[PDB]
CSV table of C-alpha atoms in Angstrom, one decimal:
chain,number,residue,atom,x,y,z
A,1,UNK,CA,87.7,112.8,88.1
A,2,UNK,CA,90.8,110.5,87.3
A,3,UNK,CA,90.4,107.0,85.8
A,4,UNK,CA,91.8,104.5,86.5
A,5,UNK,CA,91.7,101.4,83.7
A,6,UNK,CA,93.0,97.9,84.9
A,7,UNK,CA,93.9,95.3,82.5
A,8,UNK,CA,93.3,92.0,82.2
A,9,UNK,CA,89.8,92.7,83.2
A,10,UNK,CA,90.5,88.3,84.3
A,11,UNK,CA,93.8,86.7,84.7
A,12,UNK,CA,94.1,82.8,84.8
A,13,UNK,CA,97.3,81.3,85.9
A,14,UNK,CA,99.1,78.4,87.7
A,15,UNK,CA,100.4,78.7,90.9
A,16,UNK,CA,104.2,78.7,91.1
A,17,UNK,CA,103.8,81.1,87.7
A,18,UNK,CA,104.4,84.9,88.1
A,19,UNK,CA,101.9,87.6,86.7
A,20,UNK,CA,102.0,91.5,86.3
A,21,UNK,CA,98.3,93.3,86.7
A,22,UNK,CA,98.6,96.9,85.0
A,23,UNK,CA,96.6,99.9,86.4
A,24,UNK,CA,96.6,103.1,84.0
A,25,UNK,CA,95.3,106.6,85.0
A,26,UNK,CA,93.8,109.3,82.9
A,27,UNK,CA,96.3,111.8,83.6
A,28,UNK,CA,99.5,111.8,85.6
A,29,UNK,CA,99.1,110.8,89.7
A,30,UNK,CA,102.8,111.1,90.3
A,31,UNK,CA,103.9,107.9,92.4
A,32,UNK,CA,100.3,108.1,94.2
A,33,UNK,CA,98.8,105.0,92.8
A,34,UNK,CA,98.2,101.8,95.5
A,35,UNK,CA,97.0,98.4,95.5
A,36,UNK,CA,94.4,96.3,97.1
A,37,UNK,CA,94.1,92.6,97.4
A,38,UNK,CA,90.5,91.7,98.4
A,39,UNK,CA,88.6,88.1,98.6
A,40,UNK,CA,84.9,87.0,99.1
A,41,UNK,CA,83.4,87.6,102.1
A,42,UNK,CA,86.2,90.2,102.9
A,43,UNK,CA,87.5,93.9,103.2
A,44,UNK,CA,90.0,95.0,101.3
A,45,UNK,CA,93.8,94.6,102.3
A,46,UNK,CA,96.3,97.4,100.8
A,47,UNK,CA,99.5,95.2,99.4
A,48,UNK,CA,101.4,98.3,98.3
A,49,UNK,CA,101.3,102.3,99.0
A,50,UNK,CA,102.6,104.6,96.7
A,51,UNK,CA,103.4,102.7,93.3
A,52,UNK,CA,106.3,101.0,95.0
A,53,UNK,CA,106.4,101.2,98.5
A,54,UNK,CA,106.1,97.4,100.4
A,55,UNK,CA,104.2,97.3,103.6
A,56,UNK,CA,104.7,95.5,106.9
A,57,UNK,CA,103.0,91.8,107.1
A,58,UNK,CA,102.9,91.3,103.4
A,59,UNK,CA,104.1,88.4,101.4
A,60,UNK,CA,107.7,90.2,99.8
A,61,UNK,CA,106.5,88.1,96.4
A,62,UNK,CA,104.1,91.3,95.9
A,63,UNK,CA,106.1,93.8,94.1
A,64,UNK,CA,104.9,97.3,92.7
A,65,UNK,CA,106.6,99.9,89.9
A,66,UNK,CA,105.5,102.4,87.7
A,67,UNK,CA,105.1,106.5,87.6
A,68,UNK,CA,102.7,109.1,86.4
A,69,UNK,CA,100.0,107.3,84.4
A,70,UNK,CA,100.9,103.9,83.9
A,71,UNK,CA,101.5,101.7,87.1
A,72,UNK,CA,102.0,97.2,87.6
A,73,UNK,CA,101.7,95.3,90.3
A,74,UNK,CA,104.0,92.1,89.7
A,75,UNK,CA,103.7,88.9,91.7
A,76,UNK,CA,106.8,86.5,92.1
A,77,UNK,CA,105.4,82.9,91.9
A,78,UNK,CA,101.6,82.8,92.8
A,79,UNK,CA,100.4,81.0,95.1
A,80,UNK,CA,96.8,79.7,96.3
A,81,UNK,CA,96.2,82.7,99.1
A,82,UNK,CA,97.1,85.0,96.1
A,83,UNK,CA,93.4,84.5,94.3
A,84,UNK,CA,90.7,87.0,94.6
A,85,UNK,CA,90.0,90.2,93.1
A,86,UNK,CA,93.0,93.0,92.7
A,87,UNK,CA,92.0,96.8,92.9
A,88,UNK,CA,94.6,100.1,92.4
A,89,UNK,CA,93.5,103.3,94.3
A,90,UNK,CA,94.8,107.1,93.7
A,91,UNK,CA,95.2,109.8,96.2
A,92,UNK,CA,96.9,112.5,94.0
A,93,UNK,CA,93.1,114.5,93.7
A,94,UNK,CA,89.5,114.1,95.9
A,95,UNK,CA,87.5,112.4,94.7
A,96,UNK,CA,90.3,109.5,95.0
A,97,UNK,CA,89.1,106.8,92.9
A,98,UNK,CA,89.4,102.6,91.8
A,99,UNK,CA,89.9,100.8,88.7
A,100,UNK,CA,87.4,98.5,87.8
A,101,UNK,CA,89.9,95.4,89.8
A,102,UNK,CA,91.4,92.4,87.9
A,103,UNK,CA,90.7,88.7,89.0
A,104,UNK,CA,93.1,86.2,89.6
A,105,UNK,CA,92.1,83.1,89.1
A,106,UNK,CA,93.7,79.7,88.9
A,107,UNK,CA,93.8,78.7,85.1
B,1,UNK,CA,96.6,97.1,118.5
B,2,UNK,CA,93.5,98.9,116.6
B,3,UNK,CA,90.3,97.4,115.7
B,4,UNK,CA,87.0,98.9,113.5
B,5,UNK,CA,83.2,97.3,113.1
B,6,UNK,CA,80.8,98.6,111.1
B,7,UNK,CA,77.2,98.5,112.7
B,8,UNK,CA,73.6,99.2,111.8
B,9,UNK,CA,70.5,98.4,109.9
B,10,UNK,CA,71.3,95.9,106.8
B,11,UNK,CA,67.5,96.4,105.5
B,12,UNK,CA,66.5,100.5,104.7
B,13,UNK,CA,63.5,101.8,102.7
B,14,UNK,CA,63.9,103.7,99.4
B,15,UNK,CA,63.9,107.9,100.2
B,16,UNK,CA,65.2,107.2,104.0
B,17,UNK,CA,68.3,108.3,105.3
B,18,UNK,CA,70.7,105.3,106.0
B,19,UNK,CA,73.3,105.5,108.8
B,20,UNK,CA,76.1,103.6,109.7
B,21,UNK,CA,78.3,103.3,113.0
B,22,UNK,CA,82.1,102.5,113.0
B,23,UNK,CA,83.3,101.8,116.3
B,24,UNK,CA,87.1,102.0,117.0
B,25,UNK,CA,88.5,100.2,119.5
B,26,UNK,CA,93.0,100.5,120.6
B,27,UNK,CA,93.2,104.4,120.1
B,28,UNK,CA,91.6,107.6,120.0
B,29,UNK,CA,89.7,108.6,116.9
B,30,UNK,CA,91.2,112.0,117.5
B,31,UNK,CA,94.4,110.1,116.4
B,32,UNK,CA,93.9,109.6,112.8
B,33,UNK,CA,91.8,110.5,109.8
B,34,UNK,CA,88.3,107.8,109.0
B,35,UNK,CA,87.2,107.0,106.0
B,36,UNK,CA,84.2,105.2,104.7
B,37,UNK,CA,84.0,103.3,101.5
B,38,UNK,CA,81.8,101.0,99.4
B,39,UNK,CA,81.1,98.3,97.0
B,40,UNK,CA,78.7,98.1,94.9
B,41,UNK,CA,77.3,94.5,93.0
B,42,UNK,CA,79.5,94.3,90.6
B,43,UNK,CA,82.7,94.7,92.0
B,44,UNK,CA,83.1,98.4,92.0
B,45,UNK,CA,84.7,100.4,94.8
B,46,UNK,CA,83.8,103.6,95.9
B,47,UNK,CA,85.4,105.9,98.3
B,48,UNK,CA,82.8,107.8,100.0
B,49,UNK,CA,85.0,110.4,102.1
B,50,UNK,CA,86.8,110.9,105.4
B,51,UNK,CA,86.7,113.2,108.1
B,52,UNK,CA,90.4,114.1,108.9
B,53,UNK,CA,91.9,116.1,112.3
B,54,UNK,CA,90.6,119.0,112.2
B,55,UNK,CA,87.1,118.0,111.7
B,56,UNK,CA,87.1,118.9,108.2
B,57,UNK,CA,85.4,116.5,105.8
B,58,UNK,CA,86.0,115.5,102.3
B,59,UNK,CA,83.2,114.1,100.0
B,60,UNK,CA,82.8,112.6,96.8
B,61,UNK,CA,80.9,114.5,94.3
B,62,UNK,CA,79.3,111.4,92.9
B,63,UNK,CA,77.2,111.5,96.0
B,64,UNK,CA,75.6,114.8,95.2
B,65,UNK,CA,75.9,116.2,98.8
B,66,UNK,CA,74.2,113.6,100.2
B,67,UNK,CA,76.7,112.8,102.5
B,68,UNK,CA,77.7,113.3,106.4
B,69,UNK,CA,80.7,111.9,108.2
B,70,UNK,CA,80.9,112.7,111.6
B,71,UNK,CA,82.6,111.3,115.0
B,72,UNK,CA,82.0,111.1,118.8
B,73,UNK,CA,85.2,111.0,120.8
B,74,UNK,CA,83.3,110.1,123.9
B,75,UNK,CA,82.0,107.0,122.6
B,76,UNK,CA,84.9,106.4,120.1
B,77,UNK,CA,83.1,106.1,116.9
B,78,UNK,CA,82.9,107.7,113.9
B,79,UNK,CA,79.5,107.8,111.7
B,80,UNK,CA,77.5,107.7,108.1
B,81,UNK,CA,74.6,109.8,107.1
B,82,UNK,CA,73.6,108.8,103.7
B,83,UNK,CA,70.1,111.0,102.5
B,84,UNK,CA,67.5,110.0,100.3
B,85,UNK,CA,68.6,106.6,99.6
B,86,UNK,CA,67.4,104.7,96.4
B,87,UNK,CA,68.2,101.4,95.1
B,88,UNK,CA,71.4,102.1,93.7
B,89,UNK,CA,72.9,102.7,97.0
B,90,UNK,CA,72.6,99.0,97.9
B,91,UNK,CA,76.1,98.2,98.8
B,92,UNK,CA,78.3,96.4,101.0
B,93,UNK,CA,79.7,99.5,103.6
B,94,UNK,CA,83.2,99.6,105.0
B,95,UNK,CA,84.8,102.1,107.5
B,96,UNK,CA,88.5,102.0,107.2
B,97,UNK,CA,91.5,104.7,108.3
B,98,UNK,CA,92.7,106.9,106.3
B,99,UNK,CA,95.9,104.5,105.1
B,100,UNK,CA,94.0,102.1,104.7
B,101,UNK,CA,95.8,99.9,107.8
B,102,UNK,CA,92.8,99.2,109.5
B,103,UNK,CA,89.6,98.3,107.9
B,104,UNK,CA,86.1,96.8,109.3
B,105,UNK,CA,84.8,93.5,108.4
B,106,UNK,CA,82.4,95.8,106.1
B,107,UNK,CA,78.4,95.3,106.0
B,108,UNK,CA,75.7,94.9,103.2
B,109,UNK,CA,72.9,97.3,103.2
B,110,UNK,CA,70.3,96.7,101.1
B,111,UNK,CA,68.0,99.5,100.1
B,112,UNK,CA,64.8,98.2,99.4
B,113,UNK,CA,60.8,99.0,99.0
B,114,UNK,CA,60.3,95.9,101.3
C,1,UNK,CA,121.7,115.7,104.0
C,2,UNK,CA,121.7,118.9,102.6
C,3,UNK,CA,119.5,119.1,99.3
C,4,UNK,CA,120.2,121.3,96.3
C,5,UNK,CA,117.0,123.5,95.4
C,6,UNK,CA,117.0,121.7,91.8
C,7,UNK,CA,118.0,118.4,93.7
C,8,UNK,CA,115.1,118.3,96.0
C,9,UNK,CA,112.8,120.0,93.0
C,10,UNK,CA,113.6,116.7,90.8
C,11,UNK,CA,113.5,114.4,94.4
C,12,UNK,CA,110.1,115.4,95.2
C,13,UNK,CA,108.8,115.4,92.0
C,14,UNK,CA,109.9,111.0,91.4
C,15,UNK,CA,108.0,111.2,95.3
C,16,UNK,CA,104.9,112.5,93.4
C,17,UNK,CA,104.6,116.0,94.7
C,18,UNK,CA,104.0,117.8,91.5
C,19,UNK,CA,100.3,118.6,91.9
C,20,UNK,CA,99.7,116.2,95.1
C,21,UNK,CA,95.9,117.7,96.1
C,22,UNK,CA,95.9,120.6,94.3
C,23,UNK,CA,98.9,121.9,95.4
C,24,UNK,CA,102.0,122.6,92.4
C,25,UNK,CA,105.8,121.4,93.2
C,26,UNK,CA,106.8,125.0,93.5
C,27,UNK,CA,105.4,124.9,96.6
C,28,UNK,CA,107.0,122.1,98.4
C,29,UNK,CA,110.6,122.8,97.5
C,30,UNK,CA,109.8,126.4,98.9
C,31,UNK,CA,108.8,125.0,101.8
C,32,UNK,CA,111.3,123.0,102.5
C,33,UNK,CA,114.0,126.0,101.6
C,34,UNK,CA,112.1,128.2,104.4
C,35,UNK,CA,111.4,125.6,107.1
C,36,UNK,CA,114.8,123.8,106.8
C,37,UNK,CA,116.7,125.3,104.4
C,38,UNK,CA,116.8,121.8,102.8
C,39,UNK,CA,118.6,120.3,105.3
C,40,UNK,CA,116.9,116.6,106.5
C,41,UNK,CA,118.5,116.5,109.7
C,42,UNK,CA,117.0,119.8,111.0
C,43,UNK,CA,115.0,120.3,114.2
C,44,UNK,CA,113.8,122.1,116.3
C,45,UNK,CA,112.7,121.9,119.9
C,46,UNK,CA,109.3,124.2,120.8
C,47,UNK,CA,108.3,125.4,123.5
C,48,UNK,CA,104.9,122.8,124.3
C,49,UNK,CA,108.0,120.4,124.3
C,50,UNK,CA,107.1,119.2,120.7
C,51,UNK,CA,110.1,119.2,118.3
C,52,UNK,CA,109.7,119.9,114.6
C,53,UNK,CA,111.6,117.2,112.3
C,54,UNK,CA,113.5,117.1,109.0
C,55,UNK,CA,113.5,118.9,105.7
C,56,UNK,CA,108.9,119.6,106.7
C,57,UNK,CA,109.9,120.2,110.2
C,58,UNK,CA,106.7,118.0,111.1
C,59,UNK,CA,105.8,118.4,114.6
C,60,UNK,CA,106.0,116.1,117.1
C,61,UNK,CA,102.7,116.5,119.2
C,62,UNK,CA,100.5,116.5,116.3
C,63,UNK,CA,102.6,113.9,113.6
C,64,UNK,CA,105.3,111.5,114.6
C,65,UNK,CA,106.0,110.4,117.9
C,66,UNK,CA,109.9,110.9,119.7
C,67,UNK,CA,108.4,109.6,123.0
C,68,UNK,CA,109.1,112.9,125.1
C,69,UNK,CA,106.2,114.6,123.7
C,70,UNK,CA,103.3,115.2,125.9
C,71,UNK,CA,99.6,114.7,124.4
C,72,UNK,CA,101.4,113.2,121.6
C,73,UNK,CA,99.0,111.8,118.4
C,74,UNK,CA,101.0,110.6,116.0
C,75,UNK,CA,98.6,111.3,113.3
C,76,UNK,CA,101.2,110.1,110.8
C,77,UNK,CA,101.7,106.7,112.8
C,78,UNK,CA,105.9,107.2,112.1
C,79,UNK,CA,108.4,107.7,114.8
C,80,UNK,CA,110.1,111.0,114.5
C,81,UNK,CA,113.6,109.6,113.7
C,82,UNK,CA,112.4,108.8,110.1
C,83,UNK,CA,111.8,111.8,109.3
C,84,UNK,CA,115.4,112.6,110.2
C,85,UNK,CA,117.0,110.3,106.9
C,86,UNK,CA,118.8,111.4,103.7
C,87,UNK,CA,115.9,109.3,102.2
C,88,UNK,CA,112.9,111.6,102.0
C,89,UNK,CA,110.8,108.9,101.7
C,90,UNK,CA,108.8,109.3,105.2
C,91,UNK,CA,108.6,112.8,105.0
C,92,UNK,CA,107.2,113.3,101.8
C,93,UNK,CA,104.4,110.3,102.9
C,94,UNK,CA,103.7,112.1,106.4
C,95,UNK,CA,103.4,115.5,104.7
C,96,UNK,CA,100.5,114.2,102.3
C,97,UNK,CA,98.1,113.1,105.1
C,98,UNK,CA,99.2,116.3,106.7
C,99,UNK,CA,98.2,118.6,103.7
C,100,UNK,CA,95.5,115.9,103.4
C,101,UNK,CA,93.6,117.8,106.1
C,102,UNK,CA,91.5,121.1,105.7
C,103,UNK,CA,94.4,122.9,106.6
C,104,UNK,CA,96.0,121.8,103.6
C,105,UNK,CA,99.9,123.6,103.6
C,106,UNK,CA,99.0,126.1,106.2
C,107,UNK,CA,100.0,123.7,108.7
C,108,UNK,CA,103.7,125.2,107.8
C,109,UNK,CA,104.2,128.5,108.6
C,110,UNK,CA,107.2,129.5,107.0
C,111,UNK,CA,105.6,128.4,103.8
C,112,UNK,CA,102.6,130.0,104.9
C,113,UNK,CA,104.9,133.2,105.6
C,114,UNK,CA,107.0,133.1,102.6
C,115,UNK,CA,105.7,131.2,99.8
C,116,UNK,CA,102.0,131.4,100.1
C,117,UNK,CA,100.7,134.3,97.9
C,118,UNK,CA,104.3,134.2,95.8
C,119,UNK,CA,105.5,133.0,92.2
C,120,UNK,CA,106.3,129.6,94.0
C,121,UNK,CA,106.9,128.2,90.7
C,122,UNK,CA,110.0,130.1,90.5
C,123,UNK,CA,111.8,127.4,93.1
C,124,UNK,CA,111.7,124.9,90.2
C,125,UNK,CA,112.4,126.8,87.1
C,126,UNK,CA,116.2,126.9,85.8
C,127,UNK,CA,116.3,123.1,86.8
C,128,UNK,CA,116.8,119.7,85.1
C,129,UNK,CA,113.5,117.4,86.1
């Protein structure tokens, strides 16, 4: 199956300070890499669709870039409602798979 | 607008067959592909499968063919058949389209010798 | 817009077609060349009264919705015009949850007619990706 490695494993910051989350996969997935945002208590909520792509009803500071096997997904200013647990997803082969998710947590 | 709850026993014995309900209210499953997907302890996700338009259904291997998704259009719901259940299927279950619009509130399902 | 063969092999391939569920990129620009001749504005009106849009020609009772299509699904939750831009953004996202069925790329028939079963691969060789 494809892996998929996110780094930091943990990710402390301040709001008002901007972070990148990276999401590598073991072998090229083309632009068909997306991102989840999900909190306690919660199901998960997909921030951005194919590496780059925004989607309607999220905050615009959510930004996403990358190709092939090494994808980001950059936020502009963090702010409170951004902490919780970040997850990227690929559809380019079944079984689609998840990296292990990066937590953002206020430093 | 579109709507999805997950529904069913939260408690199941080891070896049983544990089955979930996703009822989807604001359009026609016949209008979009369902998915299921878990989460187990310690933060992982798992994508389970989905049952797309033509009926046709797409499983993950991890679950050694253990695995059933089906759907009434009568009653508007989509389902999960998960055989021989053992402790390491203790998860928290969530039915979701295929885009990954729409998801339920998800539910924990505990698998269990009591 | 009317693509090059090269132009829509390198377009497709930065939309992450190359390999998308098994199938190679050979096939989708061979596709497109036999369904629209790489043109995005193409359509074409059936006779159910569905219309077949863009460089895909995905169908209007089944995938996008134009509003004067009768048991319209709109499996690909799009309206129909976006998959009439230069931008083959839509398109290329509508065709993956089409060929993400069974079906997989028999759902198009000219590629089912003329590139299933050929050297596909030979609709992206001679070209800078």
């Amino acid at each position: 199956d494809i892996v998929l490695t996110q780094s930091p494993a943990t990710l402390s910051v301040t709001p008002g300070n901007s972070v990148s989350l990276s999401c590598r996969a073991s072998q090229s997935i083309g632009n068909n890499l997306h991102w989840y945002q999900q909190k306690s208590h919660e199901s998960p909520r997909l921030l951005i669709k194919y590496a780059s792509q925004s989607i309607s009803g999220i905050p615009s500071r959510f930004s996403g870039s990358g190709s092939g096997t090494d994808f980001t997904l950059s936020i502009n200013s963090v702010e409170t409602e951004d902490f919780g647990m970040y997850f990227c997803q690929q559809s380019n082969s079944w079984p689609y798979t998840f990296g292990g998710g990066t937590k953002l947590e206020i430093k | 607008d579109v709507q999805l709850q997950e529904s069913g026993p939260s408690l199941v014995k080891p070896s049983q067959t544990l089955s979930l309900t996703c009822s989807v209210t604001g359009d026609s499953i016949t209008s979009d592909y369902w998915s299921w997907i878990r989460k187990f302890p310690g933060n992982r996700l798992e994508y389970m499968g989905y049952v797309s338009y033509s009926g046709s259904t797409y499983y993950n291997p991890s679950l050694k063919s253990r695995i059933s998704i089906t759907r009434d259009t009568s009653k508007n719901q989509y389902y999960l058949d998960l055989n021989s259940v053992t402790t390491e299927d203790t998860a928290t279950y969530y039915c979701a389209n295929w885009d990954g619009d729409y998801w339920g509130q998800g539910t924990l399902v505990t698998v269990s010798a009591a | 817009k009317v693509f090059g063969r090269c132009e829509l092999a390198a377009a497709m391939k930065r939309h992450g077609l190359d390999n998308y569920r098994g199938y190679s990129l050979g096939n989708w620009v061979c596709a497109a060349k036999f369904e629209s001749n790489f043109n995005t504005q193409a359509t074409n009106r059936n006779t159910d009264g569905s219309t077949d849009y863009g460089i895909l020609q995905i169908n209007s009772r089944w995938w996008c919705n134009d509003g004067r299509t009768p048991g319209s699904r709109n499996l690909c939750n799009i309206p129909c015009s976006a998959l009439l831009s230069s931008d083959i953004t839509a398109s290329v996202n509508c065709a993956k949850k089409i060929v993400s069925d069974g079906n997989g790329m028999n759902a198009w028939v000219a590629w089912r007619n003329r590139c299933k079963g050929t050297d596909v691969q030979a609709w992206i060789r001679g070209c800078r990706l």
